[PDB]
Ligand binder design. Sequence first.
Ligand SMILES: Cc1ccc(C(=O)c2cc(O)c(O)c([N+](=O)[O-])c2)cc1
Ligand SMILES: Cc1ccc(C(=O)c2cc(O)c(O)c([N+](=O)[O-])c2)cc1
Lengths: 116, 116, 116, 116
Amino acid sequence: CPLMVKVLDAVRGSPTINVAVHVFRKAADDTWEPFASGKTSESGELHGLTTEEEFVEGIYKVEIDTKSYWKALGISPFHEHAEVVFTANDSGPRRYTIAALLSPYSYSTTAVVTNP
Amino acid sequence: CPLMVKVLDAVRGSPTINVAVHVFRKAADDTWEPFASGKTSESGELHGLTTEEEFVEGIYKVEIDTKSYWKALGISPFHEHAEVVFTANDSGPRRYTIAALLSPYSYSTTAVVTNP
Amino acid sequence: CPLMVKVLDAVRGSPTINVAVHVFRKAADDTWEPFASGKTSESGELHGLTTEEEFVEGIYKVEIDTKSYWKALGISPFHEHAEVVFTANDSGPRRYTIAALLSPYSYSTTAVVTNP
Amino acid sequence: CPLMVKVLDAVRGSPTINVAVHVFRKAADDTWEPFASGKTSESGELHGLTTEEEFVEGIYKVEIDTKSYWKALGISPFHEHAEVVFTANDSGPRRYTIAALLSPYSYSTTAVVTNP
Ligand SMILES: Cc1ccc(C(=O)c2cc(O)c(O)c([N+](=O)[O-])c2)cc1
Ligand SMILES: Cc1ccc(C(=O)c2cc(O)c(O)c([N+](=O)[O-])c2)cc1
């Protein structure tokens, strides 16, 4: 699985379940081409977005629909979404975990990049 | 000042100087109109981006050029930038501080919103 | 496994391997009684610290030896360690994951608390 | 002011007012000597804890009473407090800002260290 997304809720201390995630890859004309999408599981994780063969070098964007999550919980959010833009595989294929820790007025994102 | 951006370096424990910041506002046709730009000062802060009169209701995007900051220190970071998108002034005028805490493979962002 | 500790490195974008972790429980005389200890695995995780029978209600402290980690990497750290103090199981047994994201001059900690 | 503490609420996007802060210094016998204390102001900041003359080399502990803050808002948070332990002024006098960003199940802390 070369790309995994994990989303956590800092208000409730829980994984964020059923949050929509969209992945894009930058096109030659600096536009965002859809690439993959899904919703997080009960563990807050989204697997199976891509394969090692499709996940070539390039710039990728991960958009997490955080606003819809907080609205479903009845909490007023600040951000429209959480976005993460990064260059992938520039030094050979890696396994990427994009982790996002969500609060209504703050979020953090980290990348855990390992070599299989 | 209705909009301030502050940027900190979590590796060195210091404000980030001369980091480029670009602000955009979503137009009626759902395109990003350039709104303001600047670079952070010695204190890591960028003031004077806009005025209360110009800073009307809308969706705004703040893009911080974190990659150039790390590259100038010799580091190839994970993220291409740090981008924050939010609705502003939907309940009347507020003062917004957008703060970003930077590491090579992680960043966090918060919003401090006050009512003068 | 009622208690797991996970530690991540925000500079290198990797799990923190071989970091020492010590767990204490507060004694009747407000002193810290040792409870469990270990070192993180290749995945940055420390499992098997306790059992559901031993992990009773109480106040617990998790101390992560972050200073030794950064010294081993040749990076100057700010903190002497990372500590997390929390009340456990006050509403029935839970599964706790204590996650720490480390930078030389900053750290974050979250708790993911689930019901089996 | 050589030592400042700033505390922010990541749920509401606001500084935290009237949060208790206690500072300790490690003595020769390895005990924590009370050094200074105060409460955060309307801006979430606590100034005037010490002077450059009194703030000598040593190991210091800053304990922020985050639990009382959340309890006053009706929330039972995960952490009992936020505690930061660090060596100060080992390379000469510095100015330290300890900043804490609070959520019910997560907190982050950073240090901004400057040389006047
Ligand atoms: C920015 C941030 C801070 C803390 C967390 C975080 O709490 C977390 C929790 C996990 O169970 C876990 O498996 C991972 N991970 O794999 O990276 C991260 C996640 C994101
Ligand atoms: C995501 C994050 C976490 C912590 C900080 C942070 O450390 C910080 C430091 C300041 O001196 C300061 O004035 C503010 N602020 O007002 O927002 C934040 C900044 C950003």
